[PDB]
Design a protein around this nucleic acid. Sequence first.
RNA 1: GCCUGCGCCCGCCGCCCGCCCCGACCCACGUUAGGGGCGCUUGCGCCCCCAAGGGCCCGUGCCAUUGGCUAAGCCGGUCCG
RNA 2: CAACUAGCCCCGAAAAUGGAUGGCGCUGAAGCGCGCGACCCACACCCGGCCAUCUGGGCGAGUGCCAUGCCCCGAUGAGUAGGAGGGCGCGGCGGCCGAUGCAAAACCCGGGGCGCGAGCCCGGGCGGAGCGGCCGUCGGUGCAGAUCUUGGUGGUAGUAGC
RNA 3: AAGCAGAACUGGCGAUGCGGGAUGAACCGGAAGCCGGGUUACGGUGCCCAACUGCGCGCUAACCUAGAACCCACAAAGGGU
RNA 4: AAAUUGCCGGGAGGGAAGCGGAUGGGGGCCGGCGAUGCGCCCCGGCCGUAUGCGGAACGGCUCUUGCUGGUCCGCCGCUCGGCUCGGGGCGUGGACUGUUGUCGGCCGCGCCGGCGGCCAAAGCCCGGGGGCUCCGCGCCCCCGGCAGCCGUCGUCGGCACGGCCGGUACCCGCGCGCCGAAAGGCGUGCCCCUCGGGGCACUGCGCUGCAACGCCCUGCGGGCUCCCCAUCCGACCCGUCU
Lengths: 133, 219, 111
Amino acid sequence: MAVPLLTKKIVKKRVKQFKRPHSDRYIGLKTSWRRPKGIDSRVRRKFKGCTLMPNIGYGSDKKTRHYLPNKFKKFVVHNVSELELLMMHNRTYCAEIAHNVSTRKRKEIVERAAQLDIVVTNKLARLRSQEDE
Amino acid sequence: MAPTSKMALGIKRASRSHTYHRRGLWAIKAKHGGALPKAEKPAAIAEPKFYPADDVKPRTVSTRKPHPTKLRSTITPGTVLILLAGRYMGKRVVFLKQLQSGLLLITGPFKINGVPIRRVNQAYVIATSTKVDISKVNVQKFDDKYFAREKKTRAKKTEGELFESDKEATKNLPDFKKDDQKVIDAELIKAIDAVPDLKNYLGARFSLRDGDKPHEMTF
Amino acid sequence: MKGRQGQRVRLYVRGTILGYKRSKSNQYENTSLLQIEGVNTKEEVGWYAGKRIAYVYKAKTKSNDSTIRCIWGKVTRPHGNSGVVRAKFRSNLPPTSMGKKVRVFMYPSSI
RNA sequence: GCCUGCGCCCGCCGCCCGCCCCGACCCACGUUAGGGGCGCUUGCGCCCCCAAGGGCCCGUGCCAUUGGCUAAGCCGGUCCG
RNA sequence: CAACUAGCCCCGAAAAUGGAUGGCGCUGAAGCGCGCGACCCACACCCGGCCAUCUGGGCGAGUGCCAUGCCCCGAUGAGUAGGAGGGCGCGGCGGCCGAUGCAAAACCCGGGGCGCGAGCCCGGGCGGAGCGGCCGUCGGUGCAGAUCUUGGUGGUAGUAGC
RNA sequence: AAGCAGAACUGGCGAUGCGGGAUGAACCGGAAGCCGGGUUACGGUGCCCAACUGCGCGCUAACCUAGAACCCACAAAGGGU
RNA sequence: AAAUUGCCGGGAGGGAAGCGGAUGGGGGCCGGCGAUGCGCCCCGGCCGUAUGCGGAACGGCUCUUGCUGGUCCGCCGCUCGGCUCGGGGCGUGGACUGUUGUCGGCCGCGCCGGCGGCCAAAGCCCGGGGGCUCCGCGCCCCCGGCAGCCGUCGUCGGCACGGCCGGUACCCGCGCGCCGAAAGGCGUGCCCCUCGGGGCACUGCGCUGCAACGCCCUGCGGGCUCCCCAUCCGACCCGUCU
């Protein structure tokens, strides 16, 4: 059930990457997609090769939406209290230590996380913050 | 269409027989069926899920069926085979038996041509018109359970022990197989020499020249 | 060695990757067209369905301590009168391979 | 035509790389309607015959390690012209 | 022998930057007419997988809570002008929770990952004092232009020149 | 007369890519979610350029412009033992 | 901070043509890769239920009041036993990711076979007559008996292979007594055939992925950017006017 859906999402990819037209030659013109409003655009007219437009159909399977490639659902964890919510899920949810949190407070998150058995990315973020490559 | 016709225009003629045999005992698994088994004291969460039991039983039977017939085109024990894929490919070899796994036991005699006992897939093979007579060869010793390649559990020994790295992950030669192979090979050589020049022929190899057509070539 | 026999280095019947499946206008790289050497007709190329294909190439870099790399594929069905065939690969073959020889095996044999 | 802060270059063998557009058996009367061989009338002749191929590697544990040998070759490298 | 019919070819048919069945070239065509098969071949068509939207269901009796939820349907989806719908980002305010000199915010990063996107997340480097998330509230709220405004900086150019 | 000015009906473009017509906003085919696999349309199959130098039966020899795909890239009266 | 400039490094190359991108592959650069899984037994380690005791938050409820059901901790008595970390001892084998075998579904693929339609007849042997030819061979046409085999229409039947997707997570499929490596078969009645065999009837539950290889750490698959080569709409880049 869950496992072949994961395979479909990861292997197929619609990592098309929606680049704005003429982003390449005008630096200030942003990489971020905005819809060509004018009729005169080739991109609007839906010429192929001119970078295909974002549409809903490109969208992934409902189950595999907002999932880490491990098949875990990613949650940014601010503090110790929030770990208790993640404990209910275990396998289904992941803990990732927030940017705001400083190094000492990261350590207490890691040791608690170990007890829940949601070791993945939580430990990794902390280890860098210590000193490590 | 023709094999499936009995089942198709019957529906469950084979499976009807089994119920009536059980019923021949008297009065049985109608009553027993409601009473039968376990349930009620769960684990973890809902337990929504899957297998053992029921499911395994038709699947094992169905996977057995391709081993003759569908793959086979026809091939009797002692047919000479061409291995077109596998390691030993391009060697012509003699067919010992078909395993439960569905892989074929073969063996070219070891001294003349390098082929060991070995398991090879049926799917690869071209069935040739030649037959070598395997009347009095003891192929019996070699079986499906005989061919278990040991894994990298630990050391090959009894278990539970601290071990060393000098395992063979993708390979393993049992000493016993080497002793056994010589005996079985001896009988085969007698049959091979009976027809002239077959013995050299097996080792030589067949491959398709430029301009040769594999479709027209069919043995 | 083991897997070794008594001669033929060339294990396969030859084939050539002409191009990809195509209009005049566009190509679809998903399916590749290969004209197989010595294959004159539509009937003959019908044999080739299901066979394994290897594109073997060499590269500057090592990998698992070998400079030789390969992409595998399979023959899907025949294409056209001239003995051209349709093929899919696990990952698409590099399209610089237009005009290269590729290898079409006997490996799974229907006969 | 010339090429030294002991560099450069050729000969000789040793080890290693990198390619091929994929090497990884090989290939001559002439002609667009003739070729060959034979007896010979010795010719732009006669009679035969052919039109959709040949030969080799093909067996050297992708070519192991060893001992010897044929007809005295076959094939590579050397060398004579 | 004469008058006709209608095919192709020839003539009639002469323009300028050299030139165009698109090109090469093609003569038992690769030409021209026509027949017969095979075959090639669009985001079209089919089958399957999958997205949202719409339609019809279904499942809350509480005591896992999104019930504006979740789950089963099948069909549909180009899209300017334009409408409606559902979101994202910024600044500040009431609420609520978190983060910090043992290194905040900011800034840099051919470093990782998520989301269809709007964007988000996290690491490393730089840095040195305050800040962000979430629920409400509100705007002087998001830029590529406007012969744009203001600041900076090129090619021009080490050139015209002196 | 006009790629002209003005009506009648309808489809398109405008609001249309993709495929075809070498190339082309409007012609032809078909309206387009996202993909894999199949199968076609238009138009092709000597090579470009994916695909029969396929089969069949005719016609054509063009030194005063050989001929070669609707729209469309022009063309006629009239002449030829 | 952007812009620009410098240095240097990488890619690329000094035989070659540029919309600067997309699409594919390789290099260059870098992050990732269950803590290493399970059953069992032996030792070591720790704890103890039931029942009596002693102190309590609870329940259904009633709700003055009543009756049935609590669990737990303290920790003593009286009888027994269990679990967990590690080690020992045995069996099964789990770690991203890539590969191969298979069952089912969908679709293509080539090939073989049967019957009927089209009064059936080309057809060949036998027989008869006629015409044409009128130089005769020969040619034609028709009719009756005949192996025979044919183009086209319709339909059914059989094989051999493969692609793709998925592993069928509630009625798709199927097992539950026996033998048989195996596949597979093994009841009985009925009826047709009456031969070989066939069709047809007859119980309820439980439940949906099988074989294999590499390695997870050594080491490496990979992701991403630029570049080169391949490929392509490239109506000049967007906006506006139209």
